[PDB]
Amino acid sequence: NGFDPFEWRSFYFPGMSREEAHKLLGEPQVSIGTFLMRDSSRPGEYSLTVREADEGNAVCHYLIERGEPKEDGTAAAGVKIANQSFPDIPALLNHFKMRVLTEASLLAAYKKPIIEVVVGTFKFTGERETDLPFEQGERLEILSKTNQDWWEARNALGTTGLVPANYVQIQ
Numbered sequence: 001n002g003f004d005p006f007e008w009r010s011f012y013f014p015g016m017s018r019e020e021a022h023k024l025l026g027e028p029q030v031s032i033g034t035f036l037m038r039d040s041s042r043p044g045e046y047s048l049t050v051r052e053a054d055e056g057n058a059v060c061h062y063l064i065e066r067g068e069p070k071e072d073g074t075a076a077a078g079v080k081i082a083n084q085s086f087p088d089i090p091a092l093l094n095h096f097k098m099r100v101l102t103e104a105s106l107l108a109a110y111k112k113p114i115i116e117v118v119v120g121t122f123k124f125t126g127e128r129e130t131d132l133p134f135e136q137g138e139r140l141e142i143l144s145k146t147n148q149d150w151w152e153a154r155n156a157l158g159t160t161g162l163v164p165a166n167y168v169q170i171q
């Protein structure tokens with residue numbers, strides 16, 4: 001369909017708050033069915049945020065709770081939204097392509113607009129887990145000019161992270 005449930009980490013926004021998600025997904029040009037994942041205010045949980053209507057209640061949030069892992073260590077903990085259990089997060093996301101959460105189904109992953117297109121001028125291995133490693137000559141899309149030194153970038157795969165401004169050049 002409109003997204004690959006197995007690649008959900010590419011529509012996951014670790015830095016984003018509930019309030020920022022609500023604002024972004026609530027913007028007038030955002031189509032119903034647009035969604036993203038992010039961290040919950042609850043430790044070790046995820047939140048799914050979805051534009052489900054035009055006239056409020058426009059934007060809804062769902063706690064994705066992790067269940068109890070089997071004691072053998074040979075079956076990862078399942079996952080739950082409300083009182084529906086799923087073997088994993090991709091299974092959960094797939095399920096809501098064709099079934100509604102509250103008012104709408106998941107149609108398309110939210111994507112930030114491109115500020116500019118750049119290419120890597122040097123190789124970048126990354127320094128922190130928040131960074132986006134890239135190759136020299138690699139094409140990236142800049143999503144945010146955070147500060148003068150570090151910019152939020154997105155690679156061809158859809159993976160997002162910070163990159164040094166002095167390592168990229170307008171394409």
